[PDB]
Design a protein around this ligand. Sequence first.
Ligand SMILES: Nc1ncnc2c1ncn2[C@H]1CC[C@@H](COP(=O)(O)OP(=O)(O)OP(=O)(O)O)O1
Ligand code: SF4
Lengths: 261, 258, 259, 1140
Amino acid sequence: MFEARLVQGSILKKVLEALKDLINEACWDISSSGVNLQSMDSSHVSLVQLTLRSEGFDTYRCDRNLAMGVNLTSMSKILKCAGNEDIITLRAEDNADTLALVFEAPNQEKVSDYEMKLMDLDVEQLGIPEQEYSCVVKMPSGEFARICRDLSHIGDAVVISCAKDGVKFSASGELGNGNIKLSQTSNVDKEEEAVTIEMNEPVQLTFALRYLNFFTKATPLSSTVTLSMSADVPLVVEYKIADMGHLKYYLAPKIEDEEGS
Amino acid sequence: MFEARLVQGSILKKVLEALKDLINEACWDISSSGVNLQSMDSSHVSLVQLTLRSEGFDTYRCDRNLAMGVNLTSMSKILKCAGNEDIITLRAEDNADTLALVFEAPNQEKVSDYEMKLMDLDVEQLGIPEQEYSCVVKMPSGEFARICRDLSHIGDAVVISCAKDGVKFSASGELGNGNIKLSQTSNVDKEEEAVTIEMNEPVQLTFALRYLNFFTKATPLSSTVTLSMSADVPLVVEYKIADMGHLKYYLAPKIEDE
Amino acid sequence: MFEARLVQGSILKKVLEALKDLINEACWDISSSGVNLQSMDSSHVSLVQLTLRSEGFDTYRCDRNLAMGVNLTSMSKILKCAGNEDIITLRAEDNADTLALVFEAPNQEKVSDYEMKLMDLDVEQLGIPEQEYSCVVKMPSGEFARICRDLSHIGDAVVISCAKDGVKFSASGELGNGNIKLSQTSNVDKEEEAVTIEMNEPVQLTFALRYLNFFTKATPLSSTVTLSMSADVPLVVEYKIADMGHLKYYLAPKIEDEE
Amino acid sequence: SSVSALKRLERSQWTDKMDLRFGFERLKEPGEKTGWLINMHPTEILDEDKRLGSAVDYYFIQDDGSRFKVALPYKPYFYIATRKGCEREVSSFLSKKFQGKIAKVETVPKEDLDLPNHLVGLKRNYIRLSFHTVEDLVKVRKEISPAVKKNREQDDQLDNIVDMREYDVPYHIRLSIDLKIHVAHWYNVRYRGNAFPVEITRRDDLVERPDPVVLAFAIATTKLPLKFPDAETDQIMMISYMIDGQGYLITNREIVSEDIEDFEFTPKPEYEGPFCVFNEPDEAHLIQRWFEHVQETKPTIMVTYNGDFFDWPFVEARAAVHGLSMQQEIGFQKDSQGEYKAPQCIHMDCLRWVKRDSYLPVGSHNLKAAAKAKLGYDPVELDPEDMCRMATEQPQTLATYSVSDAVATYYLYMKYVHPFIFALCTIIPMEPDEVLRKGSGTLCEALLMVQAFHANIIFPNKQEQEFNKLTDDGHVLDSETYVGGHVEALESGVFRSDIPCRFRMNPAAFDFLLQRVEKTLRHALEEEEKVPVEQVTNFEEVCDEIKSKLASLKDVPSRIECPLIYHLDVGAMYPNIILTNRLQPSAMVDEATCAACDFNKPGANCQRKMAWQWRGEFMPASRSEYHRIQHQLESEKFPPLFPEGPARAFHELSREEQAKYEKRRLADYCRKAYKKIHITKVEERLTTICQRENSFYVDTVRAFRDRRYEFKGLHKVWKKKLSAAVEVGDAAEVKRCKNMEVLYDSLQLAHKCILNSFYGYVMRKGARWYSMEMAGIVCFTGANIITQARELIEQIGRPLELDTDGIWCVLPNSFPENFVFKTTNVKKPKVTISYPGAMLNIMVKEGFTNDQYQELAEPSSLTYVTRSENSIFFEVDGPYLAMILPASKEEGKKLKKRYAVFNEDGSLAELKGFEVKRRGELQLIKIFQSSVFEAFLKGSTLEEVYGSVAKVADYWLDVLYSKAANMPDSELFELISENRSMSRKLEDYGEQKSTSISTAKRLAEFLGDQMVKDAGLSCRYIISRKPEGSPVTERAIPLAIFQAEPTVRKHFLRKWLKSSSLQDFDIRAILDWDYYIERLGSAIQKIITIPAALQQVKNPVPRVKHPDWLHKKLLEKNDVYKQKKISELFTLEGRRQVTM
DNA sequence: GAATTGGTGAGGGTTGGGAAGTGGAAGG
DNA sequence: CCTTCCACTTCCCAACCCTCACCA
Ligand SMILES: Nc1ncnc2c1ncn2[C@H]1CC[C@@H](COP(=O)(O)OP(=O)(O)OP(=O)(O)O)O1
Ligand code: SF4
C-alpha cells in the first residue's frame, strides 16, 4: 500500500494549482524516499520537476515503490473541496484502481472522503545536466511574478541579461519596449526580502514569456525564488517548500541562425 | 387601500432575491393578519411559500383582503436601489393596478420614490398538507451551502441518509464518488453553531442538486436552516425571517423505478 | 527637452482609466503652464476637458510647447505596469518619436523603463465656453454614482430639477417610474458628506443616462462631484483633482422640442 | 339528401351547358369514331333508374378540330381484410347492413409484399366493397374506420374486420389506372347505345399529335404610388394575349390617351409576333370584348405567368364590379386551394414549372430572368411606379411592354413546357392541371401505384406518424436522421495550367498502375464503349506509350509541373447505386422474416448486408422523469378550443397537442435540471437486403433513368456536332446546333428532379412505401466511393474539392490523358478514351461491383439465375484553364462549397455558392466578387496573379473611404441595398428579433397592414448609425422612407434617429459606413489575403488587417531566433509506460 | 387534407462560465 | 490599528439557436 498524512492541505492544494495549467496528466513516482513527479509539456519546450520528501509528512508508509497516472485538472477539482486549514490523508492499494483521499477539519467536527479514479499513461524521461550555472539570483517571488506579468503584457518574449553590476529583463513589441532592472540589496532587512546575485561571468538569453506566466503560479508556495542561467543552455527556476522539498521548471532557450551560417 | 412600513428594509431585499431567479411571477396575498405568497416554479417540481406577519411591520394598514400579481424581476431591479438601512414603504390601492415603493434614508436627507405596474394573474391554490416529519434537522446555513456547492462539482444528484447519530451526504459520478458526514454533536460554543437532528425513524432520499443550488440563496436571511423529510414526501427547507415571518421550499424526491 | 516627475503616480493611472472609454486615440499637449487634453468623444455626443498644472509636478522642464498623438487604449495598458506607490517620470526630446516612462520603487531596488512610440495626429478643438450657471450642486460622488446606476437600471433618461429645499431626479420606463430627492444639509457635521445647492432660478432638464454613466468613471479620482446646470446650455459635470488639476465633461441636454 | 342531389344535378347540368357552349358536344347517339384524349374530370350521371352514379367525362379532340365528350360510369371501391375464415359472415353482415348504399362485394386473391414467405407465391383473400357513388363510400368508411382502428389498437361481426386498404385513392386516379386510360394517345371510341357501356381503346398506329388551340394572356393595372394596387380602387389599362401565334391587344382608350394600332414585334427570326389591336371605350367594354373573343376562339389550353396570384382575382373582381359573372361567362372559378380551374379547358401556369423543374436559382424565378436564360433575350424594362404616367404621356411604351410579356409567355410555354409536360402525362394517370401542380413525391407515388397495380400488389396504407418515441436507453428522442453526403475542401488558393506547381508523388503508385495498364484499357473499351477489343486494330500501339510515360514518372516522382485541371464525377449516382445493389424500399428485412423463408438454406446467396450511420438527438431527461411528468399532467386543466367552450382536461387534449405540451414541459425542466438540452449520438448499423423480392420499384427506376439517358445521348451528339461546326467556323450552323444543345440540356435537366425524387420519396412523411435504411445506405456507399477516389488521387496529385459526387483535381502535365482507337466497324469508326476515367472506373469495378444480383428465370419452377452487374461509371470533364478557391477567416476551418472555374477559351465555366447567385445579398458584395474573379484570370506569375486582384479590389475600398464622394445620389440606393424577402406572415414571426421582422414592423407604422397582410413581403433597408450602441436589429431603416414625402420622411427619421436638430437628413449622413467597410473587409479577406498567406506570399492588400492569429503565426515564422525543443538540449533517457 | 432528402454559409441574439477588481470583516 | 482572505460584482468570449437559399 501507499499511505500518507499531511497536517496542512494548503501545500498540496498550492502544488496542484501550480501544476494544473502547464501539464494535463502525469504519473507519480512513489518510493520510501518520498514522492517525485517529472513531466514535459505537450509542446516539449519546458519540463516540470517536483520533490516531496517523506520526512515532511506527519506519517508515511510505502510498502513497495509505485507509479500511477493522474489527470491533474480532475485532481485540481476534488482538492478544491479541502478546506484551507484541513488536514489531509491519502491512501492507495497496489492494484492502483483508485486513490482514496480523506480530509478532516482541525477539530474533527467533520469528515470528507473521495475516490479519485486513476488512469494509464506513457511518458519519456529526460537527463539532467547537474552543471554549475554561470549566474544565479535569489529573489522575492512576488516581485518576479510582477515582472513576468507586466512584461508579458508588453510582448511574448523576454530577454534576460545578468552582469556583476545588476540584472535586467527586457522585451519589445509594436508599442515599443520595456526594461526592468534589479540590483543587489545593500543590507539585508530579512532573508526572504533580499535580492542576491552570485555569478562567475555574465549571461544573456531569451525565452518565451508564455511559460513564465505558467511558472509564477508557484508564488503562493514561497516568498522566495531562485533563477539559474548559463550560456546557450536551459534556464532553471526553483521554488522551495520549507519541509517538503522543491518544485523546479526547466525552459529551453531560443538560439540564433548564426550556427546555420 | 393598503400601506405598510418596515424599518429593517433589507429583509424585503434578501427575501426577494432568494426568489428573483427561481420563479417568473407570482400573486401576493394581503390581509389584515399579514402578507402571504404561494407559487410554483414553472417546472412544477418545487413549491415556494412565504409569509410575513403584519405584527412585525413598523406600520400596517389593510382595510380589505387583496391579491396582486407581480413579476419578481421588476421588483428586484427596483429594490436594488434601496440601501440596506433604508426604511421601506409599500403602498397600494385595491382601486388600482400599481404598487408604490418609498425608501427613506436614515440620514433623513435622501428619499426615493418608485412606482411599478402590477401583472394580471390568477392561480389555483392549495395549502400544504400537514405531515408527521419522520426526520428533521437544524443546521447552520454555511455548512449546508458549502455541502451543496462542493457536491455540485462531483455530480448532479445527492443521496442523503440520516439517523440520530448523524446525517451523511453522498454522491457518485464519472469523476469519482464521495461523502460528507455530519455526526450529531453533543456540545457547542454557541447555539448558532449547533447541528441538531430529530428522528422517528431513519430516512434516505435523493434530491436534484441543481435545485438546492437555488434554495441555498436564502442563506443570507438566517444563521440557521431547518430540513424536514419523510419517505415518499417532499423535503421541506425552512428559513425564519427575523421575528416577522418564514420562507419555505417544498421539493419532491426523485422517483426510482424499482 | 520635456521631462516631468510625479510622486502621486496613482492619480495619473486613474486619469487614463477615465479617459480611455470616451476617446481611444487623442493628442496630449504640453506647455510651460502645464499638461492639457481636450476632445470630443468618438461618437461626437459629448466633450471632455482636462488639465494638470505644471506647479503640481515634483520637477518639470518644458523648453517648448509640444503635442503628442497617443493611443489611450495602449498607454493605459502601459500604465497598468506601474505600482501605485511608484514614482513616475516622463520625458521626450523635441525631435523624438518616442516617449519614455520610468517608474521607481521608493526602495530604488527596482526600476522599470518603458518606451512607447508616438503617432502623428492633428486634432480639431475650440476654446471651451463658460457661464455663471443658474444652478450648481455639490455632492459626495459615491451618491451620484449610485443614483445614476439606479436610474440606468429603470430606463433611458433622467429629468433633473433643482429647488431651494433640495435637488430632485426622476425617470420612467417600461416597468415603472421613480423619483428621488436629496435635501440640503441642515448643519454640516463633516464636509465630505454635505450636499449643498446654489439656486438662482428653477431649472429642469433632461439627460440621457449613458453619458452620465460614463462620466462617473472618474469617481475614484475625487471624493466630491459638482454639477453645473442652466437652461439653454450644456450641463457641465466637474471633478477637481487634488491641487493641480480638474476634469470637466460637457454634455448637451436631451431635447423635447420634437413635440 | 335531396338538397345535395338536386345541387349536384344542377351543377352537372350547368357544366354541361358551359362546355356545350364551347362546342364539346356529348356523344348522345350510337356510333364509332377516333380522337385524341386531351382532358378529363369526374362527374355523376343518371343510370337506367335515373339513380345518380359517378362517372368521368373524357374530353377528346379530332384532327379536323371537332371535339366531343364521353361520360364513362365506374363504381369506386376499396378493400377490407378479415380475421381467419370470417369472409362469408362479414360480407353477409355488410350486405344486409348498408342495403341500397353499396353496389357490390366480392372476394379477390392478391399478393401483399409484407406477407411471410411470400416469395413462394402465396397470396391472401381480400373483400372489395364498391358503391353506386363515391358519396356513399365517403360516408360508409366512417362507419367502419373507428371499429377496425380499435381492433388494431387491441391487435359483432364488424370486429372480425381486421383491416381496410386503398380507401383514400382519388377516384379518377383509380379509374385511369384500372382501365389503362392515359392522356395524349389516339383512341377508338364506340358507343353501342345505352344497353352497353362506352368503349375507349388506344390505337398505336398513329404518331402525330393534333395541334390544340392555346391562348396566353397578360394584364397591367393602375395603382397607388409606392403601394400595391387593389381590386377596389384600380382599373385595368390594357390586356394583351396571343392565340396560336396570332397576337391581340385591348386598351382602355379613356385612360390611354391615343388610339393604338396593329404592330409587329420580333425578338428572334423564329418569334415573329404579329399583333392585332382593338380599342375599347370603357373597362366594361374591354372586359366584354375579351369575354366575347374567348367565347369565339374557344381555346382549350389557357396560360398565364403566375396567374393565381394576381391576374385572375383582379380581373374577376373588376368583372364583378360591372356585374359580369366570370364564373358563368368564362367558367373559371377559384377552387378551394385558391387555384383558378375550369371544367372545359386546362389552365397552365409557367411559374409552377419554373419553380419545380427548371433548376434555375430562386434568384431567377422572375419571368425576365427565366426568359433571358432559357430564351436568350431580354424582355423589356418598366417600373410599376411609372406605368400610369407612361401610359398617359406615351402609350406605345406600355403597349410594347405588355405585348412583350405576351410574346415571352407564349413562346416559353410552347418550346419547353408543351413537349415536357405532355410527354410526362403519357405515363402519369393525372390530368395536365394535376400533373403540373402536384408535388414531386406524389407523382412518383402515382407511377409506383401504376406498376404495383400491374403487378397486382395491394397497396399499404399511408405511414402513420409516431410522436415522442423512446430510445431503448429510455431518453425521449428529439430527432432521427441518416448521415448525409461527405464533403471536404483539402486545398486553397489558385491553380492554373499556365504556371508551374510543386508536386510530390509516391513511387509505388506508378508501379501499381503500370502493372495493370492493359487490363484498365481492356475493361474501359469493352464495358464503356461496348466495342470489343477484337474489333480494333492498334491496341498495342497505345499501351507502350502509356507504359513509357508511366515509367518516366516512376523514375522521377518529385518534380515541378504545370497542372491539368480535371473533374471526375459519377453520372446519376444515386439511381445507379440503387440499381446496382438492387435496393428497394420493400426489400430490407430482419432475421425474423428470413427465419420463415423457405429459401433460407445453406449455400444460398439471397441476403446482402450493408452498413450505414444512424444519427439521433435526444433530451437528457430520464425515462423516470418523463413518465412522472406524464403522471403529473393528469391533474392539469386546459383552455377550450374557443373562448366560449368549457375548459378541457389533460385527457381531452389530442395526441398532437399532448405531445407538444409534454415536449415543452420536459425541455423547460431539463434547462434547469441538466446543463445540456440536447445530446447528439452517431451509431454504426448494418442492414440486410433481400435480392429476390419483387423488382417493381427498381424496374421503375430503370425505366425512368433510361428515359433520361435517351435525352442525355442526344445532347452528347449535338455537342459533338457543335464542336465540329465551331472548328469549321460556320456561325449559322453553330447557332442552330447551340439551339438544339440548350433545348436537350433543359429537357434532361427537367427529368433529373423527378428521377432523383425516387431516392428522397422513401423518407417522405406518410409515404406508402417508407423505410429509412434505404435512404442511409445510398448516402454511405456514396461516401465510400468518393473517399477511396480521394485516397487514390492524393498519391498522384492534389485534390482541390470533394463534394457528394465528384472530385476536382490537378494532375501532372506528363500524365497519359487521351488516346484514340481505330475500329473495324463503320458504326463506330473512331473511339476515344481518356485514362483518368478508366483508372478510377476499374477501381470502382473491383470493389463495389455486385456479385449477388439474382433474377427469376422461370415463373413456374421458382428457379433464379445469378448474374453480375455494375452500372456505376465515372466520366471525365475538362480540362479547364483556371481554378480558384476561397478560404475561411477562422483558423483551420475549411470553407467548403465555394469556387470559380474557367474554360480553356478564357470564359467563365462554373461559379458557385457566392452572393452573386443568392437572391438579394448585398449588392456591393456581388459586384466586388464578380470583378475579382474576372481579375484572377489575368497575370502571368503567382506574384502577379494576386497583384492583379489587389489593384481591382482596392477600387471598392477607395470608394468606401471616399464616402462615394462622386457617386450619383441615386446610385447609392442601388449599391448599398440588401433586398431580402420573407417566407411567412409577420403576425407569425411575432416576437423574434432580426432585421427582416424589424423592417416589416417599420413598414407597419408607415403604411399599415396592407403591406404586412400576406406572405412574400420584400424589404430594402440600410443600417444606420445615429442611435449609437443600439443593437444592430434596432437600426434598420427602409428605403421606403427615402421614397416617402419630405414631411413624412423627416417625421419618421426624427421618430427613429431620435434626432431633433438635424437639418441635413441624408442617407450619406445616416449610413453606418463602418458596417459596410467591415462587411467588405470580411469579404475581401476571404478571397485575396488569407488565400495569399496560405500560399507563402507577402501581404497582397496593405489596407486590410490580417487576423490576429495569422499575424502571430506569420511573425513567429519570420525572425532570426528559433525555439529549440528541450529534447535537443537534454538527452532522452528512455520511454516508460504506467498501467494499473 | 396535402407534403422528396441532408449539408453548409452568413449574419445576429441569447446564455453561462471564467477572470479580474474592489470592499469588508476578521485575524493578529 | 494594520494586513489578509473571502465574497460579491463586472467584463469578455464561446457555444448554440433562428432564418433564407444555394449545393449535392
Ligand atoms: N433534388 C434532389 N432530391 C434528392 N436527392 C438529390 C437531389 N439532388 C441531388 N440529390 C442527391 C442524390 C444524387 C446526388 C448527386 O446529385 P448530382 O447533381 O451530382 O447529380 P447525379 O445524380 O450525379 O447526376 P448528374 O447531374 O451528374 O447527371 O445528390
Ligand atoms: S433475403 Fe433470402 S432468406 Fe431473407 S426473405 Fe429474401 S429470400 Fe428469404
